[PDB]
Each structure stands twice: as structure tokens, then as C-alpha cells.
């Protein structure tokens, strides 16, 4: 449990050195559950990278910090943020990664309305990432708009893998209470063993974000909302009259209480709602630097 013991363990798996030897002008842009995110300038090129900083002493489960290393080493994809290097800097784990200059989807859903071409484009991109992760046994466990980042030209990428877990023939299900209350699958709140299906439920909640601006029960305390997710029928759109029958049918395959009956990522890639998906260009006008 010793802090210095965990520092030593992390040193054996990260890259050697200190990225301050090649980065300038750190500017904090976000705060997450495990640390902060900064932009930095590569001194040699003038290019911008992102740097995630996580204090080992502030982690509820320090061992989840290895998730950043496992994902960086073994899982790369068009719709997953690319991670370049990891370092131990003092008491902090620093991950130098791709900078997604378009910011997070949260800023869009809380400030503007997406049309279904844009919603389908986000869902297709997320589902392509999840289909590849799930096929290799990786569960993200924190799908929500805050975890979805954008490039300046509207490309959509999944980020924040600090909470993921792996399943396999020898470990078929996970049991840990991990996620963000309003987005958690009911079987996970019920403390039942769960699998990749919980990301599909969370994606459904994110679809409700994209239509309503906020997840269900967001006005309720997080523990109250979890009880309602667990005990009540699947949450409803507040604006059901504002979604096409195609979107509603899509959402109906995501927000299924029985995880055996929930659609998988591979199945959802074939759903007709995703035929509405626009190109990344259709997402560009939603971002702060472009909207009015």
C-alpha cells in the first residue's frame, strides 16, 4: 500500500525520463476523475500534444493506473485516442497523448442541439471502437459524453481508459463497482457479474445526452439516480417527440435491462439508424470555435 512501493512498480513499466525535457508551455484544459489534462507544445516542432497527469496519492484504486499502460501497449484504433509515452514524474503518472483539439462531446450536448445525422455519426464512431475493444475482451466502463473527444475536423475518438477491465475465458465477467452513476448499467449497479454489455447501456444513456442535453435523473443525487436505474423500467427520453422512429428503435436495443437481450456493438454496427451517419465534417459546426 506504500506510496513509494507503487512509485517503484510504475517506474518499471513506464518510459524512462521526464517529458519536460522536450515539452513547453503546459496549460491545464480539463480535470477528470483521476487527474488533470494539459496541452503542451513540442519544443522541436511546435506541435501540440496532450498530457494527462495523475497523482498516485489521490487515486481510489491506484492499480487502475496500469490501465493507461495496458491500453497504450496493445490497443490502437482509428476511433481511440492515441497514446505516445508514459512517465513517472515525482509522485505523478504522466501520459503524453494525442491532443483532441475539438474538445469533448459534453461541451456540445450541454450547449447546442444535435441532429440525427450528427448523432448517428458519433454513435457509429463509438461503436466501431467498442466493437474492436469488446472483441478483445476490453470493457471501457466509463462511456459518457465526457469520454468522447473530437478533432478540429470532426473525427470522433474514445478516451479515458483509466477504468477499463479485461474479460476472457478464465475471467468471464467483472464485479467491480466502476463508472459514473447516471450512466451505469443496471446489472452493474445491482452488483451482478457483468461484461462488455455495460458499455452498450452507457452508450444508450449518452444517446439520451445527445437528444436531451443531460442523462436521466440528472436532477437527483447520484445515489438516488442509481437506485432508480436499478429498480425502474429503462429511462425515457424527455423529448420522445423529437427522435425519429429509427433513433427510437436504435435506443431500444441499447437500454435493455436484461444484458443477454441487449444488442452487441457488432450487431449495432448493422442497425439502420447508423445509415444516417454523416461524415466528420457534419460535426464541425457543433464545436465552440465554430458555433454562434
Amino acid at each position: 500500500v506504500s506510496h513509494e512501493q507503487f512509485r517503484a512498480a510504475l517506474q518499471l513499466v513506464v518510459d524512462p525520463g521526464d517529458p519536460r525535457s522536450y515539452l513547453d508551455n503546459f496549460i491545464k484544459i480539463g480535470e477528470g476523475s483521476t487527474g488533470i489534462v494539459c496541452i503542451a507544445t513540442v519544443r522541436s516542432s511546435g506541435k501540440l500534444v496532450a498530457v494527462k497527469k495523475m497523482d498516485l496519492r489521490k487515486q481510489q484504486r491506484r492499480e487502475l493506473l496500469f490501465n493507461e499502460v495496458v491500453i497504450m501497449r496493445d490497443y490502437q484504433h482509428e476511433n481511440v485516442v492515441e497514446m505516445y509515452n508514459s512517465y513517472l514524474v515525482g509522485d505523478e503518472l504522466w501520459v503524453v497523448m494525442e491532443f483532441l483539439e475539438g474538445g469533448a462531446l459534453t461541451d456540445i450536448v450541454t450547449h447546442t442541439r444535435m441532429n440525427e445525422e450528427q448523432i448517428a455519426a458519433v454513435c457509429l464512431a463509438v461503436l466501431q471502437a467498442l466493437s474492436v475493444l469488446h472483441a478483445q475482451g476490453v470493457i471501457h466502463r466509463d462511456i459518457k459524453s465526457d469520454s468522447i473527444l473530437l478533432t478540429h475536423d470532426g473525427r470522433v475518438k474514445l478516451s479515458d481508459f483509466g477504468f477499463c477491465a479485461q474479460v476472457s475465458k478464465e475471467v468471464p465477467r467483472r464485479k467491480s463497482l466502476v463508472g459514473t452513476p447516471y450512466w451505469m448499467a443496471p446489472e452493474l449497479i445491482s452488483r451482478l457479474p457483468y461484461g462488455p454489455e455495460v458499455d452498450i447501456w452507457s452508450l444508450g444513456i449518452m444517446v439520451i445526452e445527445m437528444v436531451d442535453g443531460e442523462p436521466p435523473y440528472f436532477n437527483e443525487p447520484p445515489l438516488k439516480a442509481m437506485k432508480m436505474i436499478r429498480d425502474n423500467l429503462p429511462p425515457r427520453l424527455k423529448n420522445l417527440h423529437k427522435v425519429s422512429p429509427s433513433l427510437k428503435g436504435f435506443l431500444d436495443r441499447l437500454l435493455v435491462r436484461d444484458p443477454a437481450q441487449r444488442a452487441t456493438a457488432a450487431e449495432l454496427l448493422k442497425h439502420p439508424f447508423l445509415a444516417k451517419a454523416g461524415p466528420p465534417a457534419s460535426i464541425v459546426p457543433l464545436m465552440r470555435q465554430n458555433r454562434t
Binding site: G32, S33, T34, Q60, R61, L64, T106, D142, K144, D146, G162, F163, S176, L177, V178, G179, T180, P181, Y182, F218, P222
Partner: peptide
């Protein structure tokens, strides 16, 4: 911090 991830006890 309503949007923050939680990790069970």
C-alpha cells in the same frame, strides 16, 4: 462533481 467517475469501496 456530478459527472465524475466513482470507484467502489
Amino acid at each position: 462533481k456530478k459527472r465524475y467517475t466513482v470507484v467502489g469501496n
